[PDB]
Protein backbone atom coordinates (compact mmCIF):
# COMPACT_ATOMS: atom_id res chain seq x y z
CA UNK A 1 0.00 0.00 0.00
CA UNK A 2 2.84 2.85 0.98
CA UNK A 3 4.89 0.82 -1.49
CA UNK A 4 2.56 1.25 -4.26
CA UNK A 5 3.27 5.02 -3.98
CA UNK A 6 7.11 4.44 -5.25
CA UNK A 7 6.36 2.19 -7.98
CA UNK A 8 7.61 5.80 -10.36
CA UNK A 9 9.52 9.27 -10.22
CA UNK A 10 8.86 11.27 -7.19
CA UNK A 11 9.55 14.74 -6.73
CA UNK A 12 11.13 15.81 -3.43
CA UNK A 13 11.63 18.69 -1.21
CA UNK A 14 14.18 19.22 1.22
CA UNK A 15 13.88 21.87 4.00
CA UNK A 16 16.57 21.92 6.98
CA UNK A 17 16.52 25.05 9.67
CA UNK A 18 19.89 25.16 11.34
CA UNK A 19 21.29 26.41 14.15
CA UNK A 20 25.49 25.49 14.97
CA UNK A 21 27.02 27.36 17.71
CA UNK A 22 24.19 30.06 17.43
CA UNK A 23 25.00 30.52 13.77
CA UNK A 24 21.59 30.28 12.28
CA UNK A 25 21.30 29.10 8.33
CA UNK A 26 18.46 27.81 6.46
CA UNK A 27 18.95 24.93 3.16
CA UNK A 28 16.29 24.09 0.87
CA UNK A 29 16.21 21.37 -1.60
CA UNK A 30 14.47 19.94 -4.71
CA UNK A 31 15.12 16.85 -6.66
CA UNK A 32 13.54 13.46 -7.53
CA UNK A 33 13.78 9.77 -6.19
CA UNK A 34 13.41 6.70 -7.70
CA UNK A 35 12.85 4.09 -5.25
CA UNK A 36 12.51 0.86 -8.21
CA UNK A 37 16.34 1.80 -8.61
CA UNK A 38 17.55 2.88 -5.96
CA UNK A 39 18.31 6.36 -6.10
CA UNK A 40 17.74 10.14 -5.68
CA UNK A 41 19.37 13.47 -6.80
CA UNK A 42 19.12 16.78 -4.68
CA UNK A 43 20.32 19.96 -5.21
CA UNK A 44 20.26 21.86 -2.06
CA UNK A 45 20.91 25.46 -1.83
CA UNK A 46 22.19 27.69 1.43
CA UNK A 47 19.23 30.61 1.44
CA UNK A 48 21.23 32.34 3.74
CA UNK A 49 24.33 32.86 2.22
CA UNK A 50 27.72 30.69 3.01
CA UNK A 51 27.09 28.20 5.27
CA UNK A 52 28.78 27.97 8.88
CA UNK A 53 29.48 24.21 8.46
CA UNK A 54 30.60 21.85 5.87
CA UNK A 55 28.41 20.54 3.28
CA UNK A 56 29.50 16.85 3.96
CA UNK A 57 28.16 17.01 7.68
CA UNK A 58 24.67 17.53 6.85
CA UNK A 59 24.67 15.10 3.87
CA UNK A 60 23.15 12.48 6.49
CA UNK A 61 20.53 14.71 7.98
CA UNK A 62 19.31 15.71 4.14
CA UNK A 63 15.50 10.25 2.61
CA UNK A 64 15.51 6.28 3.51
CA UNK A 65 11.84 5.47 1.28
CA UNK A 66 14.02 5.69 -1.83
CA UNK A 67 15.86 2.88 -1.26
CA UNK A 68 15.51 -0.08 -3.35
CA UNK A 69 14.09 -3.40 -1.65
CA UNK A 70 15.00 -6.56 -3.19
CA UNK A 71 11.76 -8.70 -4.12
CA UNK A 72 12.71 -11.16 -1.36
CA UNK A 73 12.91 -8.36 1.54
CA UNK A 74 9.53 -6.09 0.45
CA UNK A 75 8.16 -7.54 4.08
CA UNK A 76 11.13 -5.47 5.65
CA UNK A 77 10.51 -1.87 4.80
CA UNK A 78 9.46 0.06 7.31
CA UNK A 79 9.90 3.33 5.26
CA UNK A 80 7.81 3.17 3.09
CA UNK A 81 4.85 1.23 4.92
CA UNK A 82 4.58 4.54 6.82
CA UNK A 83 3.46 6.25 3.96
CA UNK A 84 2.02 8.86 3.11
CA UNK A 85 1.48 9.77 6.31
CA UNK A 86 5.14 9.57 7.13
CA UNK A 87 7.46 9.19 10.09
CA UNK A 88 9.65 11.22 12.11
CA UNK A 89 13.41 10.51 11.77
CA UNK A 90 15.32 11.81 14.47
CA UNK A 91 19.08 11.84 15.09
CA UNK A 92 22.19 12.52 17.64
CA UNK A 93 25.39 13.30 15.41
CA UNK A 94 28.35 13.15 17.71
CA UNK A 95 31.54 14.12 15.82
CA UNK A 96 34.57 13.03 17.75
CA UNK A 97 36.71 15.58 19.76
CA UNK A 98 34.01 18.23 18.97
CA UNK A 99 30.36 18.89 19.15
CA UNK A 100 27.38 17.19 18.11
CA UNK A 101 24.01 18.03 16.13
CA UNK A 102 20.55 17.24 17.65
CA UNK A 103 17.80 16.69 14.14
CA UNK A 104 14.15 16.29 13.90
CA UNK A 105 12.98 15.32 10.36
CA UNK A 106 9.34 14.57 9.67
CA UNK A 107 9.22 12.97 5.85
CA UNK A 108 5.90 12.68 4.68
CA UNK A 109 3.85 13.44 1.61
CA UNK A 110 2.49 16.77 0.67
CA UNK A 111 0.27 16.55 -2.48
CA UNK A 112 2.73 14.43 -4.97
CA UNK A 113 5.61 15.83 -3.59
CA UNK A 114 7.59 14.35 -0.53
CA UNK A 115 9.33 16.50 1.62
CA UNK A 116 11.89 16.11 4.24
CA UNK A 117 11.58 18.91 6.65
CA UNK A 118 14.86 19.02 9.30
CA UNK A 119 14.78 21.07 12.25
CA UNK A 120 18.97 21.04 13.41
CA UNK A 121 20.73 21.87 16.27
CA UNK A 122 24.60 22.10 16.70
CA UNK A 123 25.99 22.58 19.83
CA UNK A 124 29.22 22.85 21.93
CA UNK A 125 31.54 22.80 18.30
CA UNK A 126 35.65 23.97 18.52
CA UNK A 127 35.92 27.61 16.66
CA UNK A 128 39.21 25.84 15.58
CA UNK A 129 37.86 22.45 14.26
CA UNK A 130 37.63 20.39 11.43
CA UNK A 131 33.63 21.77 11.35
CA UNK A 132 33.60 25.50 11.98
CA UNK A 133 36.93 25.37 10.64
CA UNK A 134 35.46 23.91 7.29
CA UNK A 135 38.60 21.62 7.34
CA UNK A 136 36.60 18.55 5.76
CA UNK A 137 37.07 17.20 1.95
CA UNK A 138 34.34 18.42 -0.51
CA UNK A 139 33.40 14.30 -0.80
CA UNK A 140 31.51 11.30 0.67
CA UNK A 141 32.60 8.04 1.54
CA UNK A 142 30.17 4.64 1.52
CA UNK A 143 28.56 3.36 4.44
CA UNK A 144 26.16 0.45 5.46
CA UNK A 145 23.56 1.63 8.00
CA UNK A 146 22.01 -1.38 10.04
CA UNK A 147 18.17 -1.18 10.14
CA UNK A 148 16.39 -2.67 13.51
CA UNK A 149 12.72 -3.15 14.62
CA UNK A 150 12.07 -1.05 17.71
CA UNK A 151 8.38 -2.81 18.13
CA UNK A 152 7.90 -1.08 21.28
CA UNK A 153 7.50 2.34 19.54
CA UNK A 154 6.41 0.87 16.45
CA UNK A 155 9.31 2.10 14.10
CA UNK A 156 13.22 1.35 13.79
CA UNK A 157 16.51 1.94 15.37
CA UNK A 158 19.89 2.74 13.87
CA UNK A 159 23.09 3.45 14.79
CA UNK A 160 26.14 3.78 12.69
CA UNK A 161 29.29 6.06 12.35
CA UNK A 162 30.28 7.94 9.33
CA UNK A 163 33.65 8.81 7.96
CA UNK A 164 34.66 12.44 7.01
CA UNK A 165 37.56 12.39 4.92
CA UNK A 166 39.96 15.52 6.60
CA UNK A 167 41.85 17.69 4.15
CA UNK A 168 44.88 16.93 5.51
CA UNK A 169 44.41 13.24 5.76
CA UNK A 170 42.89 11.82 8.02
CA UNK A 171 39.35 10.81 9.12
CA UNK A 172 37.05 12.53 11.53
CA UNK A 173 34.38 10.27 12.69
CA UNK A 174 30.79 11.19 13.28
CA UNK A 175 28.61 8.68 15.54
CA UNK A 176 24.99 8.79 14.58
CA UNK A 177 22.25 7.28 16.30
CA UNK A 178 18.82 7.70 14.59
CA UNK A 179 15.11 6.52 15.72
CA UNK A 180 12.20 6.51 13.41
CA UNK A 181 8.28 6.44 14.32
CA UNK A 182 5.46 6.51 12.70
CA UNK A 183 3.18 10.15 12.02
CA UNK A 184 -0.08 8.10 11.47
CA UNK A 185 -2.13 5.84 13.15
CA UNK A 186 -1.67 2.65 10.45
CA UNK A 187 0.19 -1.03 10.66
CA UNK A 188 3.85 -0.61 9.46
CA UNK A 189 6.11 -3.55 8.58
CA UNK A 190 8.47 -3.69 11.37
CA UNK A 191 11.83 -5.31 9.78
CA UNK A 192 13.97 -8.52 10.15
CA UNK A 193 17.86 -6.98 10.92
CA UNK A 194 19.34 -6.45 7.50
CA UNK A 195 21.50 -2.86 6.41
CA UNK A 196 21.24 -0.30 4.06
CA UNK A 197 24.42 0.31 1.86
CA UNK A 198 24.94 3.78 1.00
CA UNK A 199 26.97 5.42 -1.88
CA UNK A 200 27.23 9.14 -2.31
CA UNK A 201 28.66 11.53 -5.09
CA UNK A 202 29.24 15.40 -4.57
CA UNK A 203 29.32 17.69 -6.84
CA UNK A 204 28.73 21.10 -7.80
CA UNK A 205 26.40 22.81 -9.93
CA UNK A 206 28.78 25.58 -12.21
CA UNK A 207 26.52 27.56 -13.11
CA UNK A 208 25.14 28.05 -9.88
CA UNK A 209 26.11 31.55 -7.42
CA UNK A 210 24.84 30.75 -4.18
CA UNK A 211 26.43 28.19 -1.92
CA UNK A 212 25.06 25.05 -2.54
CA UNK A 213 25.68 21.13 -2.91
CA UNK A 214 24.70 18.41 -5.89
CA UNK A 215 24.10 15.31 -3.89
CA UNK A 216 23.54 12.20 -6.09
CA UNK A 217 22.94 8.74 -4.07
CA UNK A 218 22.18 5.12 -4.33
CA UNK A 219 20.57 3.08 -1.81
CA UNK A 220 19.92 -0.48 -1.88
CA UNK A 221 18.60 -2.72 1.10
CA UNK A 222 20.63 -5.88 1.53
CA UNK A 223 21.53 -8.32 4.29
CA UNK A 224 18.51 -11.34 4.15
CA UNK A 225 19.10 -14.88 3.17
CA UNK A 226 17.83 -15.93 -0.29
Request: charged share 25%.
Amino acid sequence: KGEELFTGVVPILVELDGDVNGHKFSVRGEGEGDATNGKLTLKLISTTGKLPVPWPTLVTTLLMVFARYPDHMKQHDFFKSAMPEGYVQERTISFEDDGYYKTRAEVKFEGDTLVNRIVLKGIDFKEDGNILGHKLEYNFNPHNVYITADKQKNGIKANFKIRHNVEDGGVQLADHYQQNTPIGDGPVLMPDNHYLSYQSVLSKDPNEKRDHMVLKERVTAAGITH
